[PDB]
Amino acid sequence: MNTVPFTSAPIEVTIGIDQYSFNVKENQPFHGIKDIPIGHVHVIHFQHADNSSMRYGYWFDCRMGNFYIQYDPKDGLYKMMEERDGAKFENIVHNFKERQMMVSYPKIDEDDTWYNLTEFVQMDKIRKIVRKDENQFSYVDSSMTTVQENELSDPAHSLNYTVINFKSREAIRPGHEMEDFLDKSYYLNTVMLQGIFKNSSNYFGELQFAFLNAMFFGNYGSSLQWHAMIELICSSATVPKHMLDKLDEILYYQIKTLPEQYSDILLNERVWNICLYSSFQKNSLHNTEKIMENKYPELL
Amino acid sequence: GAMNSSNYAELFNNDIKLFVDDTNVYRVTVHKTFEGNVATKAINGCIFTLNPKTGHLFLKIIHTSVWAGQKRLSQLAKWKTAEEVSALVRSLPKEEQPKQIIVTRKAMLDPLEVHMLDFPNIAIRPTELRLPFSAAMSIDKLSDVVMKATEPQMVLFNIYDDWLDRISSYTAFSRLTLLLRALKTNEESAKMILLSDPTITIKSYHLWPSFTDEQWITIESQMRDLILTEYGRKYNV
Numbered sequence: 001m002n003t004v005p006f007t008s009a010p011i012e013v014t015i016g017i018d019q020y021s022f023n024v025k026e027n028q029p030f031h032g033i034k035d036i037p038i039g040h041v042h043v044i045h046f047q048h049a050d051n052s053s054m055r056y057g058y059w060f061d062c063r064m065g066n067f068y069i070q071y072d073p074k075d076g077l078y079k080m081m082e083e084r085d086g087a088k089f090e091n092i093v094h095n096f097k098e099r100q101m102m103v104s105y106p107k108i109d110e111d112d113t114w115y116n117l118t119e120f121v122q123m124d125k126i127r128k129i130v131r132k133d134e135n136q137f138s139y140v141d142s143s144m145t146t147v148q149e150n151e152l153s154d155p156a157h158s159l160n161y162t163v164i165n166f167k168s169r170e171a172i173r174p175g176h177e178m179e180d181f182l183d184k185s186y187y188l189n190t191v192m193l194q195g196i197f198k199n200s201s202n203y204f205g206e207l208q209f210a211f212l213n214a215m216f217f218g219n220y221g222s223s224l225q226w227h228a229m230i231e232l233i234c235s236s237a238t239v240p241k242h243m244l245d246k247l248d249e250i251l252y253y254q255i256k257t258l259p260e261q262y263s264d265i266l267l268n269e270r271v272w273n274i275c276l277y278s279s280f281q282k283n284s285l286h287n288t289e290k291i292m293e294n295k296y297p298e299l300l
Numbered sequence: 301g302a303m304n305s306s307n308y309a310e311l312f313n314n315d316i317k318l319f320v321d322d323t324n325v326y327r328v329t330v331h332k333t334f335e336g337n338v339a340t341k342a343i344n345g346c347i348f349t350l351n352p353k354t355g356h357l358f359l360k361i362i363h364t365s366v367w368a369g370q371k372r373l374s375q376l377a378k379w380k381t382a383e384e385v386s387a388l389v390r391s392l393p394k395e396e397q398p399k400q401i402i403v404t405r406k407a408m409l410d411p412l413e414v415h416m417l418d419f420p421n422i423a424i425r426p427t428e429l430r431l432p433f434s435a436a437m438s439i440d441k442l443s444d445v446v447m448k449a450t451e452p453q454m455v456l457f458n459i460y461d462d463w464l465d466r467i468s469s470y471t472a473f474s475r476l477t478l479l480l481r482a483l484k485t486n487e488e489s490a491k492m493i494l495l496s497d498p499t500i501t502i503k504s505y506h507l508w509p510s511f512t513d514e515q516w517i518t519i520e521s522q523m524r525d526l527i528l529t530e531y532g533r534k535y536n537v
Contacts, residue, residue, distance in 0.1 A: 167410070169417050177414050178379035 002062035003093045003102070004044060005032035006078075007070040012049035013078065016057065016216065018042055018114050019257060020106055023049075031101040032069070032093070038062060040114060041121050044069065045216050046078050055217045056141035061123040064136045068092075080137050116253035117212060120205035129160050129209065140213055146221035159213070159221060162196060162206060164228040166235075183280070185238040192232065200243050203229065204250060211254050214266055227271045234275035234285075244284040251288040255295070263296050273300055303402050303427035311352045312469040317400040318358075320385055321348040321433035322408055324446075325362050326377035342367050346446045347381050348436050349388060351398075353469045355460030360384045361446055361453040382411035388454075389419060398422060404431050431477065438483035438491070441507050461506040466513070475520065479508070482523040485530045493522045 009030040015022050017033050024030045036042060045057025058080040060067050065082050066089040072079050083089040096102055107114075123136075130138035146159040165171060171187045172180045180186050197203040207229040213222035233239055233247060258266060276282060276289050277300075292300065303310075311317065325347055328340035345362040366380060367373050389397050400423045401416075403409060413424050437443045445455050460472045467475075482490040500509045511519060531537065 167413055167417065172414055172417060177383070178376070178411070181410070181414050 001035045001105075002038055003032055003034045003097075004036060004060075004062075005068045005092055005096055005102070006030055007068065010071045010073070014047045014049065016043070016045040016047075017105060019117075021045075022103060029101050030103075031096040031099075032103075033105055034093075034097060034102045035105045035107075036062060037105065037107060037114075040118050041123055041126065043212065043216060044080070048077075054142050056139065057216060058137045058139055059123070059126050059130070060137035064123060067137055080135070080139070082136060113253060113257060116249065117257060118208060119250070120201045121209050121212075122205055125202060125205050126209060129206070131156075131158075131160060140217055140219065142217045142219060144219060144221075146225060148224075149221045159219070159225075161210060161221070161225045162192070164192070164225070164232055166231075183235075183237045184232055185236040188232050188236040189238065200240065200246075204243075204246065208250065208254075215254075215258060215262075218265070220265075223266055223268075227268045230275055231271050231279075234279035234281045237280040239281065239284075244281060248285045248287045251285065252291055255288060255291050260295075263299060267296065267299055269299050276300070301425065303425055303429060305429070308429075309470065311473065314353075315400065316351065316396065316398045317353075317402060318385075318398045319348075319350045319352060319402050319404060319431070319433070320381065320408060320412070321350075321404040321431070321436070322378060322381040323405070323434040324348065324437055325381050326367070326373055342373075344446050344449055345377075346436070346442070347384055348433050349385060350433075350459060352473050355458040355464060355472065357457040357459045358388055359442065359445070359455040359457060360388070361449045361455060363449055363452050366452070378408055378411045379415075381408060382415040385412060386415040386418075389416070389422070400425055402427050404429075404433055432480040432484045435480040435484035435487070438480070438487050439507050441502075457507065459507065461503070461508055461510075475516070478520060478523050478527075482526050485527055489526050490523065493519065493526065 009024045009028050010026065012026040013024055015024055015030075015033075017036070033044070041059055041061050043057050043059045045055060047055045056077060058067075060080065066084075066086065067080055067082055068089075069078050070081055071077070083092075123138075126138050127133070127136075130140060132138065140159070144157055144159055146161050147155075148161065148163045148165070150158060151163075166181065166184070166187075170191055171184070173186060176186070193200060193203060197206070207226060210222040210226040210229070213219045214226060230247075230251070233243065272292065276285060276292060325345045327343045327345040329343065330338060330340055333339050342364045344364055347358075347360040347362065349358040349360065350356070362377075362380065362384075367376075370376055385401065397419070399421070401412065402425045403412060404427060406426045409424055409426055416422055416424060437446065442457070445453075459476060463472045463475065479490070479494075482493075494509060500511060500515065502509050
């Protein structure tokens with residue numbers, strides 16, 4: 001079990017860790033989150049009580065170092081930093097626990113939610129979508145735009161998701177125009193799975209990271225990427241059986257976890273009705289279809 | 301963006317553009333089988349691709365052989381149309397390729413867009429106008445060359461005959477669409493009107509009779525009257 005200490009909490013902020021979150025008051029003696037489950041990526045995120053605009057946060061993995069949060073009064077936000085002095089860090093952490101000023105990562109032992117949401121998400125891949133190679137953790141926020149969004153401005157702040165575009169030369173082989181546009185199997189399996197992602201787990205990893213960014217920050221380009229990666233699978237007649245079965249599980253826990261009140265901006269009516277009811281893979285998302293129907297029959 | 305009454309004069313500027321109409325690409329007769337089931341029999345069709353400024357018509361004849369052994373033919377028709385339009389663009393010298401293609405039905409946007417990916421600077425637009433180009437097979441010479449074809453074939457015409465020697469594109473297009481509108485609403489009358497007078501003939505290299513200017517005024521008014529009459533009948537007004 002790992003710890004992320006906090007130097008202080010000077011501004012009233014709502015703090016999230018993964019799917020959990022806590023209200024902390026201005027200059028409340030909050031000094032970190034302990035018992036964080038090792039072996040998964042994690043995300044710590046923030047929303048100032050004064051600017052319900054701009055949720056922001058940091059993706060990290062404690063195995064990659066000792067990380068802590070510190071408020072910056074110049075830039076006006078809680079910053080993740082790394083402590084390279086291992087001894088100095090255990091000292092701060094042990095003292096704060098002794099003083100019991102830390103919240104416990106509140107995992108129910110029955111609960112595999114976070115695992116199911118992050119099964120294929122690896123820190124190494126996140127740091128290729130959020131390129132900032134002097135930090136071992138990755139910053140994301142509400143406002144950041146994706147590479148594809150920029151194309152249609154500052155590339156240092158870009159989410160370098162894989163560009164998927166159904167009406168591109170990449171998507172469409174010459175002479176198979178109609179075939180490849182109605183049956184994207186080529187694009188999925190040759191171009192994307194074998195070509196760019198190399199295997200299905202990396203594909204699912206990006207899909208999942210995109211969803212969590214949409215969910216935790218309302219990042220609209222991530223929502224677009226998530227729907228695109230779903231649609232690509234669902235619009236392919238030939239998908240490995242192991243990917244279909246895993247996709248239904250992936251989407252299930254994503255739909256289960258979404259706040260009930262946000263279904264309107266986070267769920268694209270067309271893509272879902274197409275995936276669940278029109279696509280080749282209509283019959284392959286039984287769990288995701290059952291929970292979509294019993295929870296958001298309006299969208300359908 | 302879409303084409304409508306506002307931006308209607310853009311059709312007559314000097315940007316090369318073509319209208320594509322696919323309504324007559326996949327044509328069938330519907331009949332009863334011996335067991336009494338319904339079956340279709342395909343007949344030859346055409347793609348109506350027209351430059352509205354110059355009157356040049358690229359009539360791509362769609363021979364029934366194209367369908368043989370194919371499923372979901374009405375969907376395939378859209379892709380074949382897009383395929384043939386793209387090939388037409390590729391066959392034209394660079395300075396003749398259009399800057400825009402306006403499809404008369406929105407179902408053609410994705411097929412054509414996909415077939416034109418090699419031409420990213422050609423814009424594929426829909427339109428809100430309700431153009432009567434389906435009545436193209438009411439023009440006797442067009443229907444004749446489609447129905448007689450024995451193989452895929454492209455036939456070129458000027459759909460304005462020689463009108464542009466005396467009138468503008470705007471007026472030529474308006475005349476064409478009025479003739480076609482009338483042919484669409486009541487073909488028998490429309491054709492009666494055009495041919496009543498046997499002393500006004502159709503040149504071998506033309507589609508429409510060689511009316512004088514005054515006679516075109518009478519004709520156009522007769523076509524107008526036809527169209528309004530049919531409206532009252534359709535709706536009881």
